[PDB]
Amino acid sequence: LFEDMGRLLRSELDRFEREKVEDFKSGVETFLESAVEAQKELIEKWETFLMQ
Amino acid sequence: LFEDMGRLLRSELDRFEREKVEDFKSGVETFLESAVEAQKELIEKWETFLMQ
Questions:
Q1: Which residues of B touch A42 (CB under 8 A)?
Q2: What CA–CA distance (Å, rounded) separates B24 from A32?
Q3: How far is the C-alpha of B19 from the C-alpha of A28, rounded, in Å?
Q4: Helix axes B2-50, A2-50, angle to 10 degrees
Q5: In chain A, whose CA is at the least distance from the CA of B39?
Q6: How far is it, in rounded angstroms, from Cα B35 to Cα B52?
Q7: Cβ B32 vs Cβ A50: under 8 Å
Q8: Residue A35: its chain B contacts at CB < 8 A?
Q9: How far is residue A46's CA from residue B31's CA, in Å, rounded to a whole number?
Q10: Residue A39 Cα, gap to closest chain B Cα (Å)
Q11: Which of A39, B18, B27, B51 could form an S-S bond across to B39 if both were Cys, CB 3.0 to 4.6 Å?
């Protein structure tokens, strides 16, 4: 049974590792957006102070 | 002489005051160039890991 636990575990494993990227990908995305937006944030700040 | 020292101080004070503004505008310009350069550099970082 103990064997089959290792097998399973491997199946799972491939699944975890695989999971992993994805989490972060999305992670990475949260970042990505935050940055572009940040430059946007500045841009509105600019627009205004042009408007000043 | 004392009267004309204060007079000299006036002439100096308005010069000085205008000066202070000019510096912080160039100051603000140094910030501006770094901020925009940062976001470009970041787009290039982003690009690198799309291509991987």
A1: 35
A2: 32
A3: 45
A4: 140
A5: A39
A6: 26
A7: no
A8: 39, 42
A9: 13
A10: 7
A11: A39
Taking contacts as CB-CB distances below 8 angstroms, the residues of chain B near A29 are: none
Experimental method: cryo-EM
CA distance A49 to B28: 13
What are the structure tokens assigned to B31, written together?
């910030």
Q: Choosing among B25, B42, B45, which should be mutated to test the A contact, i.e. which has the most A CBs within 10 A?
A: B42
Q: Which two tokens stand for residue A29?
A: 């995305």
**Resolution, angstroms, 1 dp:** 11.4
Distances (CA, A) of B13 to B8, B18, B19: 9, 9, 10
CA-based nearest distance B50→chain A, Å: 11
| The two three-digit tokens of residue A49, written as one number | 């102070």
